[PDB]
Design a protein around this ligand. Structure first.
Ligand code: NA
Ligand code: NA
Ligand code: NA
Ligand code: NA
Lengths: 137, 138, 138, 136
C-alpha cells in the first residue's frame, strides 16, 4: 500500500485556530455587517467633530473623528486601519485609509451632503466604488 | 420575438444587503465568524444548578445564563434562536436539548462534562453529527 | 459536587466541519461568495422557452438550464435547494416562483426582463424586499 | 449639517468592491475547507500524485510530482506556488509561496501511518490543523 486510495475523514482538529490566524473570523464578522445587513445611520456633527453610529441586526458600530486628525477604524472587510478625513469641498469629506498590518487594495470612503437632502457614502477599493444613499428619517 | 441570448455585463446591483438581511445571511455569517473561525476562551461561574458562561472570541463576547431544569433561550451554533433545556445526565455531565423558535432544521443539542482529570468537554450535535471541544483551566 | 467554575482554555476542537455541513453552512458560504462578493458576467442562450444561463465569477462558473412552464430544481440566492417554476409575464419578462425543498424561509422569487433599450434586468425578491441587477450586452 | 437619523434607500455595487477585496475567494475557500466534510481520492503513480477532494459545494483536483513546483491554492483560496518533498519515506511536506500579496507562511504535510491512516496537516504561522482519514 502507498497513498493511493479512497479516504474518508475520521477527525478534523483545530481548524478554528487556523481560520483565526488567517483573519477569516474578522472578514466574516465584517461582511455580516457591511454586505448582509440593512444599516441605519445616526450622525452627530459638532463643528468638524463627527460621531457616526451604524446600526445593524448583528452589530452597532460607533466611530468618532475630527476632520484633519488621524484615527483608527476598520476597512469594509474588517482590517484595522489608520484613517484621515479631509474636506474635499464644503459638503464632501474624503477619508484615506492605511492598513495597520499587511497589504491590500487602496481603500477610501467619502461622505457628502447633497443639494437634494441626501447623504451619500462611497467606499472605494483600487478605483472600484460602492455607493450608499440615505435620506433623513 | 425578444431574444435574451447574449454575453451580458453587469452595470448595477442595487439593494442586495436588504435581501441578505431578510434571508438571515447576516445572522449566520456573524454566528459562523464566532463558532467556526475563532479560537474561544470560556469563563464559567457555577452556583449549584445556576450557570453563567462567557465565551470570548476576537469578534464577539457571548454571555449566557441558565438554571438546570428551567427552559431558556439561546442561539444555535448557526445563530438561530432556540429554546434550550439543560438536565443532568450524571453528576459530572449536563445535556441540553434545543428546539427552534421559528422554522425547521437539524435536531441540535450540546453537552458539557467535567472529567475526573479536570478537563471541560463541550459536545455540539446536529442530527447524526458530533463536534467536541476540550478545555483545561488556565 | 463537581464545580464547572473556571477560566477555560481550548486545547482541541474536533469535527466542526461535519456539523457545518449538516447545517448547510457550506452551501450558504459558497452561494454568498458568488452572489454577494463577485461581479458576475452572464451568458444566456435562449431556444424558444428553453434557457441556458452561464454565470462566470472569479470563484465559480455556474450553468443552469430550464424550460418556461416546467418545474425544475435550482438554489435560492443564499444556496438553499428549491423547486422553481418560470412563467412569461410578457414577451419581454419571465417570473420565477421558488419553493424550498427542505425547511421554511422567506418567499423567494426572481424575474428576468429584456428592456426596449437592450438592458437585461434581474430582480430577486424575498418577502417584501427586492434586489435589482442591470446588465448590457458586451 | 450631517447631523441626523439617516435611512438607507440605495446600496449599489457592493459585490464589485468585495470582489476587488478578495472576499469572494476567502468565502469560497472556507465553504470547502471549514464547512464541508471532505472525501479524498488519491492516485499515486510512482511519485506523481492526483488528489481529488470532493465536497457538497466543490470538487478540487491537484496534480503534482514530488520535487517539481506546481500551482495550487492556500487553504483560504489564494494562488500559490507549491513544492512537495519527502521528509521521510511515508511523509511529504509542501512549502507554499503566494503569487500575489502578503500573508502567513503556509505549508501542508501528508503522511501514511503504519496503522493505515492518512494524516493531512495544514499550517499557517505555526498554527496547525490536522485531518485524519482511513480507507473507505
Ligand atoms: Na466649516
Ligand atoms: Na460598472
Ligand atoms: Na442574470
Ligand atoms: Na451587490
Amino acid at each position: 500500500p502507498n497513498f493511493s486510495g479512497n479516504w474518508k475523514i475520521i477527525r478534523s482538529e483545530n481548524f478554528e485556530e487556523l481560520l483565526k490566524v488567517l483573519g477569516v473570523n474578522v472578514m466574516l464578522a465584517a461582511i455580516a455587517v457591511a454586505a448582509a445587513s440593512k444599516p441605519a445611520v445616526e450622525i452627530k456633527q459638532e463643528g468638524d467633530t463627527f460621531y457616526i453610529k451604524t446600526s445593524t441586526t448583528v452589530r452597532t458600530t460607533e466611530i468618532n473623528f475630527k476632520v484633519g486628525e488621524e484615527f483608527e477604524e476598520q476597512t469594509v472587510d474588517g482590517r484595522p486601519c489608520k484613517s484621515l478625513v479631509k474636506w474635499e469641498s464644503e459638503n464632501k469629506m474624503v477619508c484615506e485609509q492605511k492598513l495597520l498590518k499587511g497589504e491590500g487594495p487602496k481603500t477610501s470612503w467619502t461622505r457628502e451632503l447633497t443639494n437634494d437632502g441626501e447623504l451619500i457614502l462611497t467606499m472605494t477599493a483600487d478605483d472600484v466604488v460602492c455607493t450608499r444613499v440615505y435620506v433623513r428619517e
